[PDB]
Protein backbone atom coordinates (compact mmCIF):
# COMPACT_ATOMS: atom_id res chain seq x y z
CA UNK A 1 0.00 0.00 0.00
CA UNK A 2 0.94 3.73 -0.05
CA UNK A 3 3.88 5.08 2.01
CA UNK A 4 2.62 7.59 4.65
CA UNK A 5 3.50 11.28 4.51
CA UNK A 6 3.50 14.21 6.97
CA UNK A 7 3.80 17.97 6.55
CA UNK A 8 7.39 19.20 7.11
CA UNK A 9 6.05 22.32 8.95
CA UNK A 10 3.21 22.98 11.40
CA UNK A 11 2.87 19.24 11.76
CA UNK A 12 1.41 19.06 15.25
CA UNK A 13 -0.35 22.46 15.57
CA UNK A 14 -3.84 20.83 16.04
CA UNK A 15 -2.64 17.98 18.29
CA UNK A 16 -1.53 20.39 21.04
CA UNK A 17 -4.67 22.54 20.90
CA UNK A 18 -7.84 21.87 22.77
CA UNK A 19 -10.61 20.09 20.98
CA UNK A 20 -12.60 23.35 20.95
CA UNK A 21 -10.22 24.67 18.23
CA UNK A 22 -10.53 21.88 15.65
CA UNK A 23 -13.55 19.74 16.60
CA UNK A 24 -15.94 21.78 14.50
CA UNK A 25 -18.84 19.30 14.95
CA UNK A 26 -19.07 20.34 18.61
CA UNK A 27 -19.08 24.07 17.89
CA UNK A 28 -22.23 26.02 18.90
CA UNK A 29 -23.13 28.72 16.30
CA UNK A 30 -23.91 32.23 17.67
CA UNK A 31 -26.72 33.70 15.50
CA UNK A 32 -27.02 37.34 14.53
CA UNK A 33 -30.05 39.35 13.34
CA UNK A 34 -31.06 38.59 9.72
CA UNK A 35 -33.03 41.93 9.63
CA UNK A 36 -29.72 43.85 9.85
CA UNK A 37 -29.05 42.92 6.21
CA UNK A 38 -30.79 43.95 3.01
CA UNK A 39 -29.90 41.95 -0.13
CA UNK A 40 -29.08 44.20 -3.16
CA UNK A 41 -28.02 41.92 -6.02
CA UNK A 42 -27.05 38.33 -6.76
CA UNK A 43 -23.30 38.03 -7.54
CA UNK A 44 -23.11 34.31 -8.34
CA UNK A 45 -24.25 30.78 -7.62
CA UNK A 46 -21.99 27.76 -7.15
CA UNK A 47 -22.49 24.11 -6.09
CA UNK A 48 -22.89 24.88 -2.39
CA UNK A 49 -24.06 28.53 -2.16
CA UNK A 50 -25.60 31.70 -3.62
CA UNK A 51 -23.60 34.91 -3.08
CA UNK A 52 -25.11 38.41 -2.83
CA UNK A 53 -24.06 42.02 -2.46
CA UNK A 54 -25.98 43.41 0.54
CA UNK A 55 -26.09 46.40 2.86
CA UNK A 56 -25.76 46.29 6.65
CA UNK A 57 -28.58 48.72 7.58
CA UNK A 58 -27.04 49.34 11.08
CA UNK A 59 -23.95 51.13 9.63
CA UNK A 60 -24.98 51.61 5.92
CA UNK A 61 -21.87 49.54 4.96
CA UNK A 62 -21.63 47.12 2.01
CA UNK A 63 -21.31 43.42 2.88
CA UNK A 64 -21.38 40.07 1.05
CA UNK A 65 -23.89 37.39 2.01
CA UNK A 66 -23.25 33.72 1.18
CA UNK A 67 -26.45 31.69 1.61
CA UNK A 68 -25.55 28.03 1.91
CA UNK A 69 -27.52 25.40 -0.07
CA UNK A 70 -29.23 22.76 2.13
CA UNK A 71 -26.71 20.12 0.97
CA UNK A 72 -24.82 19.25 4.20
CA UNK A 73 -24.46 20.16 7.89
CA UNK A 74 -20.82 19.09 8.46
CA UNK A 75 -19.42 21.31 5.73
CA UNK A 76 -21.19 24.35 7.22
CA UNK A 77 -19.82 24.01 10.77
CA UNK A 78 -16.34 23.37 9.40
CA UNK A 79 -16.33 26.56 7.31
CA UNK A 80 -17.71 28.61 10.24
CA UNK A 81 -15.11 27.25 12.69
CA UNK A 82 -12.27 27.87 10.21
CA UNK A 83 -13.41 31.43 9.48
CA UNK A 84 -13.72 32.22 13.22
CA UNK A 85 -10.29 30.66 13.91
CA UNK A 86 -8.59 32.74 11.21
CA UNK A 87 -10.51 35.98 11.71
CA UNK A 88 -8.22 39.02 11.84
CA UNK A 89 -5.34 37.15 10.19
CA UNK A 90 -3.38 38.82 7.36
CA UNK A 91 -5.36 39.00 4.14
CA UNK A 92 -8.05 36.54 5.43
CA UNK A 93 -11.65 37.49 4.57
CA UNK A 94 -13.48 38.68 7.72
CA UNK A 95 -16.65 36.84 8.73
CA UNK A 96 -18.82 39.67 10.17
CA UNK A 97 -21.95 37.64 11.10
CA UNK A 98 -23.92 34.40 10.74
CA UNK A 99 -27.70 34.73 10.32
CA UNK A 100 -30.53 32.28 9.47
CA UNK A 101 -31.95 33.12 6.01
CA UNK A 102 -35.77 33.28 6.27
CA UNK A 103 -36.38 31.87 2.77
CA UNK A 104 -33.80 29.05 2.48
CA UNK A 105 -33.93 28.29 6.29
CA UNK A 106 -30.15 27.68 6.00
CA UNK A 107 -27.20 29.68 7.44
CA UNK A 108 -26.11 32.83 5.66
CA UNK A 109 -22.55 33.95 6.27
CA UNK A 110 -22.00 37.72 6.20
CA UNK A 111 -18.52 38.94 5.12
CA UNK A 112 -16.71 42.25 4.70
CA UNK A 113 -17.05 43.57 1.13
CA UNK A 114 -13.84 43.93 -0.95
CA UNK A 115 -14.80 44.80 -4.57
CA UNK A 116 -16.97 43.35 -7.41
CA UNK A 117 -13.64 42.16 -9.03
CA UNK A 118 -11.91 38.82 -8.51
CA UNK A 119 -8.19 38.30 -9.23
CA UNK A 120 -9.08 36.53 -12.51
CA UNK A 121 -10.27 39.97 -13.82
CA UNK A 122 -6.88 41.62 -13.17
CA UNK A 123 -4.19 38.93 -13.07
CA UNK A 124 -3.55 38.86 -16.76
CA UNK A 125 -2.79 42.60 -16.94
CA UNK A 126 -0.52 43.32 -14.02
CA UNK A 127 2.99 44.62 -14.24
CA UNK A 128 5.99 42.50 -13.10
CA UNK A 129 6.11 44.50 -9.84
CA UNK A 130 2.38 43.99 -9.18
CA UNK A 131 2.63 40.21 -9.75
CA UNK A 132 5.41 40.07 -7.08
CA UNK A 133 3.50 42.39 -4.76
CA UNK A 134 0.20 40.47 -4.87
CA UNK A 135 1.92 37.08 -4.71
CA UNK A 136 3.61 38.22 -1.47
CA UNK A 137 0.19 39.28 -0.13
CA UNK A 138 -1.33 35.82 -0.96
CA UNK A 139 1.64 34.17 0.79
CA UNK A 140 0.92 36.11 3.99
CA UNK A 141 -2.62 34.59 4.02
CA UNK A 142 -1.32 31.07 3.26
CA UNK A 143 1.43 31.08 5.87
CA UNK A 144 -1.08 32.35 8.42
CA UNK A 145 -3.68 29.68 7.74
CA UNK A 146 -1.06 26.90 7.55
CA UNK A 147 0.49 28.11 10.88
CA UNK A 148 -3.00 27.83 12.29
CA UNK A 149 -3.29 24.17 11.21
CA UNK A 150 -5.56 24.83 8.20
CA UNK A 151 -5.25 24.02 4.51
CA UNK A 152 -7.34 26.11 2.07
CA UNK A 153 -7.60 23.44 -0.66
CA UNK A 154 -9.17 25.76 -3.26
CA UNK A 155 -6.55 28.34 -4.11
CA UNK A 156 -7.38 29.82 -7.55
CA UNK A 157 -7.82 33.36 -9.05
CA UNK A 158 -11.58 33.42 -8.37
CA UNK A 159 -10.85 32.96 -4.62
CA UNK A 160 -8.55 36.00 -4.41
CA UNK A 161 -10.54 39.26 -4.17
CA UNK A 162 -8.52 42.34 -5.10
CA UNK A 163 -9.17 46.05 -4.67
CA UNK A 164 -6.48 47.20 -7.16
CA UNK A 165 -7.15 50.90 -6.45
CA UNK A 166 -6.33 50.34 -2.71
CA UNK A 167 -3.71 47.54 -3.35
CA UNK A 168 -5.63 45.25 -0.94
CA UNK A 169 -6.14 41.49 -1.25
CA UNK A 170 -8.35 38.91 0.57
CA UNK A 171 -8.33 35.12 0.31
CA UNK A 172 -12.00 34.02 0.26
CA UNK A 173 -14.18 30.84 0.01
CA UNK A 174 -13.07 28.67 2.89
CA UNK A 175 -15.82 26.10 2.10
CA UNK A 176 -13.27 23.45 1.14
CA UNK A 177 -10.77 24.25 3.88
CA UNK A 178 -9.79 21.58 6.39
CA UNK A 179 -7.80 21.12 9.59
CA UNK A 180 -4.51 19.33 9.05
CA UNK A 181 -4.02 16.27 11.31
CA UNK A 182 -0.80 14.22 10.72
CA UNK A 183 -1.54 10.82 9.19
CA UNK A 184 -5.14 11.70 8.26
CA UNK A 185 -6.39 10.57 4.84
CA UNK A 186 -8.34 13.31 3.08
CA UNK A 187 -10.76 13.47 0.17
CA UNK A 188 -8.89 14.09 -3.16
CA UNK A 189 -12.03 15.71 -4.71
CA UNK A 190 -10.91 19.22 -3.74
CA UNK A 191 -9.60 22.29 -5.65
CA UNK A 192 -10.61 23.26 -9.20
CA UNK A 193 -9.29 21.10 -12.13
CA UNK A 194 -6.54 23.41 -13.33
CA UNK A 195 -5.16 24.00 -9.84
CA UNK A 196 -5.31 20.38 -8.57
CA UNK A 197 -1.94 19.10 -7.33
CA UNK A 198 -0.48 15.84 -8.65
CA UNK A 199 -1.20 14.23 -5.25
CA UNK A 200 -4.97 14.70 -5.94
CA UNK A 201 -4.61 13.51 -9.55
CA UNK A 202 -2.85 10.25 -8.55
CA UNK A 203 -5.35 9.69 -5.65
CA UNK A 204 -2.79 10.09 -2.81
CA UNK A 205 -4.92 10.95 0.28
CA UNK A 206 -2.30 11.80 2.91
CA UNK A 207 -1.63 15.31 1.62
CA UNK A 208 -1.08 18.56 3.53
CA UNK A 209 -0.60 22.37 3.34
CA UNK A 210 1.76 21.84 0.36
CA UNK A 211 -1.26 21.28 -1.89
CA UNK A 212 -1.94 25.06 -1.65
CA UNK A 213 1.63 25.73 -2.81
CA UNK A 214 1.11 23.76 -6.04
CA UNK A 215 -2.12 25.74 -6.68
CA UNK A 216 -0.23 29.00 -6.03
CA UNK A 217 2.48 27.88 -8.53
CA UNK A 218 -0.22 27.32 -11.17
CA UNK A 219 -1.45 30.90 -10.59
CA UNK A 220 2.10 32.28 -10.85
CA UNK A 221 2.81 30.42 -14.10
CA UNK A 222 -0.38 31.72 -15.59
CA UNK A 223 0.53 35.31 -14.65
CA UNK A 224 4.17 35.37 -15.71
CA UNK A 225 3.63 33.47 -18.93
CA UNK A 226 0.27 34.99 -19.80
CA UNK A 227 -1.28 31.56 -20.35
CA UNK A 228 -4.61 30.88 -18.73
CA UNK A 229 -4.76 28.31 -17.43
CA UNK A 230 -1.18 27.12 -17.47
CA UNK A 231 -2.05 23.38 -17.30
CA UNK A 232 -5.14 23.06 -19.51
CA UNK A 233 -6.57 19.62 -18.91
CA UNK A 234 -9.80 18.40 -20.54
CA UNK A 235 -10.68 16.30 -17.41
CA UNK A 236 -8.76 15.12 -14.28
CA UNK A 237 -6.83 12.47 -16.25
CA UNK A 238 -5.71 14.74 -19.05
CA UNK A 239 -4.87 17.29 -16.29
CA UNK A 240 -2.01 15.00 -15.16
CA UNK A 241 -0.88 14.40 -18.79
CA UNK A 242 -0.71 18.23 -19.32
CA UNK A 243 1.47 18.51 -16.21
CA UNK A 244 3.70 15.61 -17.43
CA UNK A 245 4.25 17.30 -20.79
CA UNK A 246 5.97 20.12 -18.81
CA UNK A 247 7.55 18.42 -15.78
CA UNK A 248 8.29 15.13 -17.57
CA UNK A 249 7.24 11.56 -16.94
CA UNK A 250 10.48 10.35 -15.27
CA UNK A 251 10.00 12.66 -12.25
CA UNK A 252 6.30 11.60 -12.13
CA UNK A 253 7.27 7.92 -11.92
CA UNK A 254 9.93 8.75 -9.29
CA UNK A 255 7.17 10.48 -7.23
CA UNK A 256 4.67 7.63 -7.45
CA UNK A 257 7.52 5.09 -6.76
CA UNK A 258 8.64 7.07 -3.62
CA UNK A 259 5.15 6.88 -2.13
CA UNK A 260 4.44 3.38 -3.51
CA UNK A 261 1.37 4.79 -5.40
CA UNK A 262 0.04 2.82 -8.35
CA UNK A 263 -1.29 4.96 -11.22
CA UNK A 264 -4.84 4.29 -12.41
CA UNK A 265 -4.30 1.87 -15.41
CA UNK A 266 -6.18 4.30 -17.58
CA UNK A 267 -2.94 6.29 -17.76
CA UNK A 268 -1.19 3.44 -19.67
CA UNK A 269 -2.73 4.57 -23.01
CA UNK A 270 -2.52 8.42 -22.53
CA UNK A 271 0.51 9.38 -20.40
CA UNK A 272 3.33 8.50 -22.84
CA UNK A 273 7.02 9.48 -22.32
CA UNK A 274 7.91 13.20 -21.92
CA UNK A 275 11.15 14.90 -21.00
CA UNK A 276 11.21 17.78 -18.50
CA UNK A 277 10.97 21.08 -20.40
CA UNK A 278 13.14 24.08 -19.56
CA UNK A 279 10.94 27.04 -18.31
CA UNK A 280 12.40 29.22 -21.13
CA UNK A 281 10.17 27.22 -23.60
CA UNK A 282 7.18 29.27 -22.28
CA UNK A 283 8.81 32.73 -22.78
CA UNK A 284 7.93 34.79 -25.83
CA UNK A 285 7.94 38.45 -26.89
CA UNK A 286 4.53 39.02 -25.21
CA UNK A 287 5.38 37.82 -21.67
CA UNK A 288 9.10 38.42 -21.49
CA UNK A 289 8.84 41.55 -19.43
CA UNK A 290 7.21 39.40 -16.66
CA UNK A 291 9.88 36.77 -16.62
CA UNK A 292 13.17 36.99 -14.76
CA UNK A 293 15.66 34.34 -13.58
CA UNK A 294 14.26 34.85 -10.03
CA UNK A 295 10.63 34.28 -11.19
CA UNK A 296 11.64 31.06 -12.98
CA UNK A 297 13.62 29.73 -10.03
CA UNK A 298 10.72 30.50 -7.65
CA UNK A 299 8.19 28.82 -10.00
CA UNK A 300 10.45 25.76 -10.35
CA UNK A 301 10.42 25.36 -6.56
CA UNK A 302 6.62 25.46 -6.32
CA UNK A 303 5.76 23.23 -9.30
CA UNK A 304 7.25 19.95 -8.05
CA UNK A 305 5.49 16.62 -8.16
CA UNK A 306 6.76 15.67 -4.70
CA UNK A 307 4.61 17.65 -2.28
CA UNK A 308 7.32 17.30 0.40
CA UNK A 309 9.84 19.04 -1.92
CA UNK A 310 7.85 22.21 -2.62
CA UNK A 311 8.63 25.49 -0.90
CA UNK A 312 6.53 26.16 2.19
CA UNK A 313 4.72 29.49 2.33
CA UNK A 314 7.32 30.97 4.73
CA UNK A 315 10.25 29.68 2.58
CA UNK A 316 8.53 31.17 -0.50
CA UNK A 317 8.41 34.61 1.26
CA UNK A 318 12.19 34.40 1.69
CA UNK A 319 12.77 33.92 -2.08
CA UNK A 320 14.85 36.49 -4.08
CA UNK A 321 11.85 37.06 -6.34
CA UNK A 322 10.42 39.21 -3.51
CA UNK A 323 13.54 41.27 -2.78
CA UNK A 324 12.23 44.13 -5.01
CA UNK A 325 8.89 44.30 -3.15
CA UNK A 326 8.70 47.15 -0.58
C1 LIG B 1 -17.27 38.61 -3.90
O2 LIG B 1 -16.77 39.06 -2.64
C3 LIG B 1 -16.73 38.17 -1.60
C4 LIG B 1 -17.02 36.82 -1.69
C5 LIG B 1 -16.98 36.00 -0.57
C6 LIG B 1 -17.38 34.54 -0.67
C7 LIG B 1 -16.76 33.45 0.17
O8 LIG B 1 -15.85 33.82 1.07
O9 LIG B 1 -17.09 32.29 0.04
C10 LIG B 1 -16.63 36.57 0.65
C11 LIG B 1 -16.33 37.91 0.75
C12 LIG B 1 -16.37 38.73 -0.37
O13 LIG B 1 -16.06 40.05 -0.23
Nearest atom (ligand 1) to Cα of 43: 1
Going along the chain from its start, the domains and CATH numbers come out as 5-22+114-326 (1.10.510.10), 23-113 (3.30.200.20)
Q: Cα dist. 240→39, 137, 299, 303, 305 in Å?
A: 42, 29, 18, 13, 10
**Cα 253 to chain centroid, rounded:** 26
Closest CA to 246 of 281, 276, 214: 276
Breaks in the chain after residues, C-to-N cutoff 2.5 Å? none
How far apart CA 288 and CA 280 sit, in angstroms, is: 10
DSSP 274-297: -PPPPGGGG--TTTGGG--HHHHH
Spatial CB neighbours of 183, under 8 Å, sequence gap ≥ 6? 4, 6, 206
- Phi, psi for residue 202 in degrees, rounded to 5: -105, 10
Residue whose CA is at the smallest distance from ligand 1 atom 5: 172
Q: Which residues are annotated as a binding site for ATP?
A: 43-51, 66
193 CB burial (10 A radius; 0-12, 13-18, 19+):
middle
Taking each helix axis from N to C terminus, what angle separates 236-247 and 249-258, rounded to the nearest 10 degrees? 110
Q: Are 104 and 67 in contact (CB under 8 A)?
A: yes
83 ligand 1 Cβ < 6 A? no
Query: What distance in Å separates the CA atoms of residue 198 and residue 304, rounded to the nearest whole number?
Result: 9
Q: At what angle do helices 210-225 and 293-302 cross, to 10 degrees?
A: 150
- Exposure of 76 in the CB half-sphere (CA atoms within 13 A): 19
Ligand 1, atom 13, residue with closest C-alpha: 113
Strand order in the sheet with 107-112: 37-45, 49-56, 61-68, 107-112, 95-100
Question: Residue of the nearest CA to atom 6 in ligand 1?
Answer: 173
Give the SS3 label for residue 324: coil
Which of 154, 173, 208, 212 is catalytic? The answer is: 154
41: Cβ contacts below 8 Å, ≥ 6 apart: 52, 53
The CB density around residue 235, as the number of other CB atoms within 10 Å, is 9
Q: Ramachandran region of residue 169, left (φ > 0), alpha (ψ -120 to 50) or beta?
A: beta
CA distance 88 to 150: 15
Q: What is the C-alpha to C-alpha distance for residues 272 and 164, in angstroms, rounded to an integer?
A: 43
Q: How many residues does the chain have?
A: 326
Cα–Cα distance for residue pair 178/196, rounded to 1 Å: 16
Identify the burial level of 258 via C-beta atoms within 10 angstroms of its C-beta, where 0-12 means exposed, 13-18 middle and 19 or more buried. Answer: middle
Query: Which residues is 255 bridged to in the sheet?
Result: none
Please calculate the CA angle 90-96-98 and round it to the nearest 5 degrees. 130
Q: Are 301 and 310 in contact (CB under 8 A)?
A: yes
Inter-residue contact 138 to 72 (CB < 8 Å): no
State in Å: Cα 103 to ligand 1 middle. 21
Chain-centroid distance of CA 114 in Å reads 18
- Decide if 264 is catalytic: no
Half-sphere exposure of 1 (CA within 13 A, CB side): 4
Q: Beta-strand (E) ranges in 88-183? A: 95-100, 107-112, 150-151, 160-163, 168-171, 178-179
Looking from the CA of residue 113, the nearest atom of ligand 1 is 13
Cis omega (within 30 of 0) on the bond before 76? no
Element (H, E) at 299: helix 293-302
Q: Under a CB-based contact definition with an 8 Å cutoff, are residues 79 and 175 in contact? A: yes
For every residue of 5-54, DSSP letters joined together read: ---SSSTTTTTTS-HHHH-GGGPPP----GGGEEEEEEEEE-SSEEEEEE
Q: Which helix (H) or strand (E) holds 67?
A: strand 61-68
In the chain, the largest separation of any two C-alpha atoms, in whole Å, equals 62
Other C-beta atoms closer than 10 Å to the C-beta of 58 total 10
Phi-psi region of 141 (alpha: psi -120 to 50; beta: other; left: phi over 0): alpha
Amino acid sequence: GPVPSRARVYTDVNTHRPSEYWDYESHVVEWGNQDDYQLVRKLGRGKYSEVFEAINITNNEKVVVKILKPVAAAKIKREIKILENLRGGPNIITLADIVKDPVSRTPALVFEHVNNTDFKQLYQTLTDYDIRFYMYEILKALDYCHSMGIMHRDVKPHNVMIDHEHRKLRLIDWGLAEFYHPGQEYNVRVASRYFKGPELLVDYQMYDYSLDMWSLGCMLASMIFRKEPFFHGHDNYDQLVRIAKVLGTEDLYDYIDKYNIELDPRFNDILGRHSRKRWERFVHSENQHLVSPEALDFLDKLLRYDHQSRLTAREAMEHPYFYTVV
